């Protein structure tokens, strides 16, 4: 039993809710919140900008030190950093950004990072300003992630479309 509330169950292990991931993280304080990161961990907008803003820029300060030491992530890769005031940990995952021409097949590799964590609060990878089709992202999530994932979808309209079209 966990503390996530109001989710619709899509499969054995995937759940979905119309929610603001920042507010959801602030209430649940999950072990892991997933960030929709880029390879430079520059959290300027979308989910990343909102998560970082909620940490009063502490996420960005920590991220800049990580990059200075380790260099950029790979598209499809991830790193575990602090969750600050939002979660115990933040799993920064880089889905492909269609608006940069990155290969959509890397979306499966990106979701594989979730399997290293038993339970996660997450957005749909490569959705929003990353330019991929969110219905496709949900399909890849369901077909790739085997651990327990609670998906927060900010836009109520998109949420309804994702549920109604789910196979
Ligand atoms: C590539 S993206 O991350 O922008 C993708 C596109 C749609 C919006 N995104 C979110 N999904 C879940 N919760 C969210 N809170 C947010 C707060 C914001 F100020 C902006 C986006 C989100 C958000 C997912």
Swiss-Prot record:
It is found in: Host endoplasmic reticulum membrane. Coiled coil: none annotated. It catalyses: Thiol-dependent hydrolysis of ester, thioester, amide, peptide and isopeptide bonds formed by the C-terminal Gly of ubiquitin (a 76-residue protein attached to proteins as an intracellular targeting signal). It comes from the Viruses. Inhibited in vitro by GRL-0617. It is a multi-pass membrane protein. Residues 1-167 form the Macro domain. Responsible for the cleavages located at the N-terminus of the replicase polyprotein. Participates together with nsp4 in the assembly of virally-induced cytoplasmic double-membrane vesicles necessary for viral replication. Antagonizes innate immune induction of type I interferon by blocking the phosphorylation, dimerization and subsequent nuclear translocation of host IRF3. Also prevents host NF-kappa-B signaling. In addition, PL-PRO possesses a deubiquitinating/deISGylating activity and processes both 'Lys-48'- and 'Lys-63'-linked polyubiquitin chains from cellular substrates. May form homohexamers. Interacts with N protein. This is Papain-like protease nsp3.
């Amino acid at each position: 039993v966990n503390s996530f509330s109001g989710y619709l169950k899509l499969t054995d292990n995937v759940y979905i809710k119309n929610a603001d991931i920042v507010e959801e993280a602030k209430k649940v304080k999950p072990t892991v919140v997933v960030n929709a990161a880029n390879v430079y961990l520059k959290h300027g907008g979308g989910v990343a900008g909102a998560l970082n803003k909620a940490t009063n820029n502490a996420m960005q300060v920590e991220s800049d030190d990580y990059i200075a030491t380790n260099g950029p992530l790979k598209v499809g890769g991830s790193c575990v950093l602090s969750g600050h005031n939002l979660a115990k940990h933040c799993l920064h995952v880089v889905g492909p950004n269609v608006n940069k021409g990155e290969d959509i097949q890397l979306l499966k590799s990106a979701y594989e990072n979730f399997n290293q964590h038993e339970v996660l609060l997450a957005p749909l990878l490569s959705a929003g300003i990353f330019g991929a089709d969110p219905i496709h992202s949900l399909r890849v999530c369901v077909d790739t992630v085997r651990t327990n994932v609670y998906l927060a979808v900010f836009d109520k309209n998109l949420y309804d479309k994702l549920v109604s079209s789910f196979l």
